[PDB]
Design a protein around this ligand. Structure first.
Ligand SMILES: [Fe+3]
Ligand SMILES: [Fe+3]
Ligand SMILES: [Fe+3]
Ligand SMILES: [Fe+3]
Lengths: 238, 202, 238, 238, 202, 202, 238, 202
């Protein structure tokens, strides 16, 4: 199998750069259209990170920052599969996540919300997908976060995530939400995505059979990255 | 067939998860950073630095930047590189940094990349691929950094020549300086407005 | 009958100038709104072209450039009527067309697509409508054309056309497509038109009863131009 | 695993022999019903063809007959999977195809249509499916072909194909069409198939994500052959 | 479960794709044809020939025929043959031909097949499986060719005996002739009408 | 009532069909062009020339321009002209040109038009109606060219006075020059941005 | 205008030759398919009949055979337009009709039905269409007619008609029925037509506004013949 | 677009309306019949006669036949004839007849037609176009009558040569006989079965 380029990003499946309802985008969006290029080795390659350098609790947000006790909040496991658009598993991709604590408070110098800080919660984790493209992490469900877009704007509970996989063209940062949160329908950030079906692709689903009795709930969330086409005739990449 | 997961902004606290030390969080033993040079890395050491500006001309003090590039011989440290050449074994080819919260300056310590094959037998000029994430940016913005001392190679570069507005090509050329015997390339990014930097859909 | 002005152009029935999904429009669209004016003789007049100066093959794209043989591709006849918005026939209007060959290749210095050139095909024609507003031309069906908007953009098969009729205000250039082409639903150029019904007004229909056995297929395509109102009271045009 | 016989051919899923709307069938169809037999080794075996005897361009109809230049017409890739009725892949099956050129003209002594011949196009190819049952070939999209059934009959664009696989009972020759062609609804040959769902099983689908930028479009078309049952009790085949 | 892809006629130009040399097309180095005998093939060499007739008694001059048969010892050169016996290594067992455009005669050079096991311990008489494709034929027509000098074996053949109209069995028996010391079996096929050849659903 | 056929861009190859000689295509004996002066045409000969610029200040090298105007006595050579006056018989009143592929300059050879009646007894100042088609332009852009030496008439023109932003009226006034005794009016068009040319919905 | 050939007859819009439910067709239908030919002058020409040779009562079935009094039955006028498939009027076409009397009895030597003969009714008429393609005749509404197909078969009330128009290819004989007759749904002759919409095209409609007070009812029935295509390129007819 | 009015059988009493004298009905002063020869008609007088048979070999005694043909110089007496030649003024070119109720014989008195141009510069052999209507026939059956003494012209006729089964062409050739010095062509029609007459879709 000789691989060719990644399939084109479908711009209609993503938010536009200029989205006036999300105010900060007004001055941080290019006026010019993006220039599309044909891919080269630069775009189809990406770094490799070694499993040996990850700590044992890197994917356990409940314990990786606990000092005197456990963090306060809802114990949840999040798991799922990372695949490319043609359904193939994405192996050994680096997945990084970050989030607020149970109060909706971020451990960040620029966050002054009055919701309480939790001395035993950090809010970041990471992991590598396995050979089936599977990932699993455990955390405290984050609380919704008020912010200043319009004065009374509130983000639904959410976890930020980032993927570095096989090709630089697959690089992606997004956020996922939790089934049933009523704030999902009001969020201006989620509303930058033009289509309803794509907005739903960011909602993690309650996975009842995988809850752990007297311990933790569980949410299932799969992620799809761009996929490479195979070449059977001329190989122009090089 | 499946659709790609849609992008969403990184938000203003993107450092909690991608540069926890910048947010004052010590959870990991090994941290990812902006230094791509290991002691045995081959090549010419350079510093790449600059600021990112919004449409009012003000620097973004919450931007996160990553770069991806080839080693000194133009080989990527990736299993997808098909050149059949051995890559420098002490080179990750990638790094991440954040702008300083007060000034907006960002920097990377790296090596000047060698030329990489382009499509159909062409040769690309030396370049670093760069992506920008921040509050207000809905999808990471991709650009490339070329070097002003590689005039000949830039003139023949397939990607630069594919930008039909010739005046905009210059926004992708970093300026070489020499601070204390250290070679520095200054690359400022203007997200919007006059002299707006070219961004690519890759 | 004393004629007054052409009815106002309905801007909602046309694409807007600024259409970000068609990238080239971003820098070639006015920032200011168009200034509407009341019509004068300048806007209600237009030139007259003489039938005597047209060659016998001007409307036959299959033969007007053939040198050594016939062009390769699908032999099709296209016919229809040109009328104004009030249903009146547009007589002796100049209709000019241009298109790619069967490979989707244009005979133009700036076209480097790899689809093969056809030494016996030129790709342009012209004709005058008759007194019933009828026009007919014959050509080779053009192939779809890849182009750089997003990297993998492909135009559906199409024929470009232009009309110069009775009034300068009726001046119009557009493109028509062929019934059933699956690329019609994906085209960013066709999608600049805001309404579905107007997008359908550019699709030429298979006209089976008018196919010529063992020779050519046939498509029917009618065109509507702006129409003049009649005046029964004050005549302010002059 | 001990294999038994192929499942019975479902005659209602195929055209009947006598189909009066396809005129040539009237004198070339048996008056007697076919005699069904229980299968023997004769019916469950088939020949093996060696990959070593195939040339490098046997599946590339764009280049396998090009002499002075490339053929004129629409560059398309066709790919898909061959499986049996129980969903198992058909490995190393011989797939042969043939078709008209872009003008709807066949390179055959008995074809006198006026659509132009293309000196750089032959119109036949072949290939073996791989272990996953996958096949891929590249060609020029054929133009529709007028023929004499009723005087003004026109075949939709189509590619003829033939399969020799594992069992002689699976032997099959058919034709596939292209999504959206308006002639598909009028064709008397396609109408010999009694059911609408089976007529749709011969339509190749536009596969947009697999188009190759500034080069070729792509169609996806899967084929299902008869499948063998496994035996767990008496083995009567022999 | 999936339904079989529906059949469609081969059409009048079936030779472009299945016998390009008959259509005057040289695209392949190795071509498939009607000669099943290689120099070292074992067995008695025979020529099988005939014409195919339509319902008016006229020959089809655009018919394509293929045959499938066992080697001289009744073993098929197929991985699906379960006899546990070694097959002749220089025998494909299959061939393809087209009727002559002017006369309608078709022919194959092959070997007389050995007897093959039938179901439930029976023995089939020597036979060649044949399929016909052409303009006007919506699904390939399957038949078998038995030999008139194998009277005893034919009398006991399971498939011939499963045709309840005894008079129709004879349409499947080819007639042995000897042209120049060459053994020829003549097998004419009548698609429709009087003495219509038996066709099978296999 | 019917809706107008919707407009679509002319695309980058608009010259194949509207100026085949510029695309190097000789199919027509008689071709339409940018010369409106015939030997017996009445009036003052002028050359109208300029460039069209995009929002980055760069010329469009693929733009197609047409003009429509009255003869020297302000009468249109159109059956719809109702003035009851005889028009110059050797004047089409229309022409078409394309910008040069390398420089972007366009030009027409024509005659300076006479004043034409405006609505309700008014008089329009001398003007040429112009339309622009090109890749990126979804609907032909209409504008008018007035002349800087017709100050008095321009001051009273109904259409210029209907533009309420007085500063924008000047974008419609061409500048008279005299190259070699030839009278030239320079008219540059700025599609977007600073000093953007006024475009009309007519 | 140079005329080319008539459009192909759409065989799916007509009954097939072999229709087993209409018993007499079993031995009077060709076994071979019809051979379609390209048209020549023979097929596009037809005779001309002169208006001067028609009698004054040729289109008045109520009076053209009356001897001692008027025929018994329902006084009806039938009128309509004859056009070609492209909607053009068929001028001066010869229209001939024939029918049974009010009892359902035909004045024919081979009719032995017991319904009474009417000494003042003949049952045949003729006329030429005018320049608008209009025809009008007056008659007695025929009664339904029992016949031997199955033993108790009954034809709905009907009038037989024949047209000789501009081209021999337009030659047509058919029958029309009367709105609301319940026998229309049971007739095996009407059921030879395969489609419901075509069966409805033979039903004359009650035309209430055109009834003549205290005198006659009126039915409207239009007829469509094949139409000629116009030629704009090669003229191969000759 | 409209669909053609669907055909229906003429039924067994087709003579009431098309040949009222055969049904014993005198309603018309002028009647249409089977005599195409007027006193001044030009050309060779011939009688065309025969029977129409059903699938059991029995004659149809209720069939109605019409013929359409050109004059002695191959010109049709139709406004649609485009030859630019003058047609015989005393020739309708059409006639209608019914088979005898007892015997099934039908006949026409006409003239032997001259050759008519075929498509693309070809020449058709002399022929008469004939249509048959009757009980049991759902759509009028079209055929043509050629003449056996026009061997050379028939051999070159475009329509006869377009029938690919050569054996069926003979069903369209009438046999010349000479009864009493009268020239008679016998043309029997077999609607179904062996030697079935060719019918056309025109
Ligand atoms: Fe957040
Ligand atoms: Fe075909
Ligand atoms: Fe185009
Ligand atoms: Fe009747």
């Amino acid at each position: 199998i000789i691989w060719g380029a990644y399939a084109q990003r479908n711009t209609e499946d993503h938010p536009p750069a200029y989205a006036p309802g999300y105010k900060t985008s007004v001055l941080r969006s290019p006026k010019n259209a993006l220039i599309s290029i044909a891919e080269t080795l630069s775009e189809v390659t990406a770094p490799h990170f070694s499993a040996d350098k990850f700590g044992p609790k890197d994917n356990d947000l409940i314990l990786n920052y606990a000092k005197d006790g456990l963090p306060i909040g809802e114990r949840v496991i999040v798991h799922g599969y990372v695949r490319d658009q043609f359904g193939r598993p994405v192996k050994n991709a680096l997945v990084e996540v970050w989030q607020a604590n149970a109060s909706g408070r971020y451990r960040h110098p620029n966050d002054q919300y009055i919701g309480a800080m939790d001395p035993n919660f950090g809010g970041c984790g990471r992991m590598l997908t396995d050979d089936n493209g599977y990932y699993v992490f455990r955390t405290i469900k984050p609380g919704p976060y008020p912010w200043r877009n319009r004065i009374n704007e509130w983000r639904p509970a959410h976890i930020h995530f980032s993927l570095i996989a096989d090709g630089w063209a697959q690089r992606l940062i997004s956020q996922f939400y939790f089934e049933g949160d009523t704030l999902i329908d009001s969020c201006p950030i989620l509303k930058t995505i033009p289509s309803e079906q794509q907005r739903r692709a960011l909602i993690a689903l309650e996975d009842k059979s995988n809850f752990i009795e007297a311990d933790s709930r569980c949410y299932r969330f799969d992620i799809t990255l761009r996929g490479r086409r195979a070449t059977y005739f001329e190989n122009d990449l090089t | 067939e499946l659709k790609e997961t849609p992008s969403q902004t990184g938000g203003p606290y993107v450092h909690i998860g991608l540069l926890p030390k910048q947010a004052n969080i010590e959870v990991f033993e090994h941290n990812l950073d902006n230094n791509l040079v290991q002691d045995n890395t081959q090549g010419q050491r350079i510093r790449l630095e600059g600021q990112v500006f919004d449409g009012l001309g003000l620097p973004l003090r919450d931007v996160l930047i990553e770069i991806w590039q080839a080693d000194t011989n133009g080989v990527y440290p990736s299993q997808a590189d098909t050149q059949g050449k051995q890559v420098d074994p002490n080179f990750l080819g990638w790094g991440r940094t954040g702008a300083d919260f007060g000034t907006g300056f960002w920097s990377f310590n790296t090596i000047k990349p060698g030329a990489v094959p382009g499509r159909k037998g062409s040769t690309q000029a030396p370049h670093i691929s760069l992506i920008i994430f921040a509050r207000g940016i809905n999808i990471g913005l991709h650009t490339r950094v070329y070097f002003d001392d590689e005039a000949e190679a830039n003139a023949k570069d397939p990607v630069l020549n594919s930008i039909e507005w010739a005046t905009r090509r210059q926004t992708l050329v970093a300026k070489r300086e020499e601070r204390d015997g250290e070679v520095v390339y200054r690359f400022d990014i203007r997200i919007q407005g006059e002299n707006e930097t070219v961004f690519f859909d890759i």
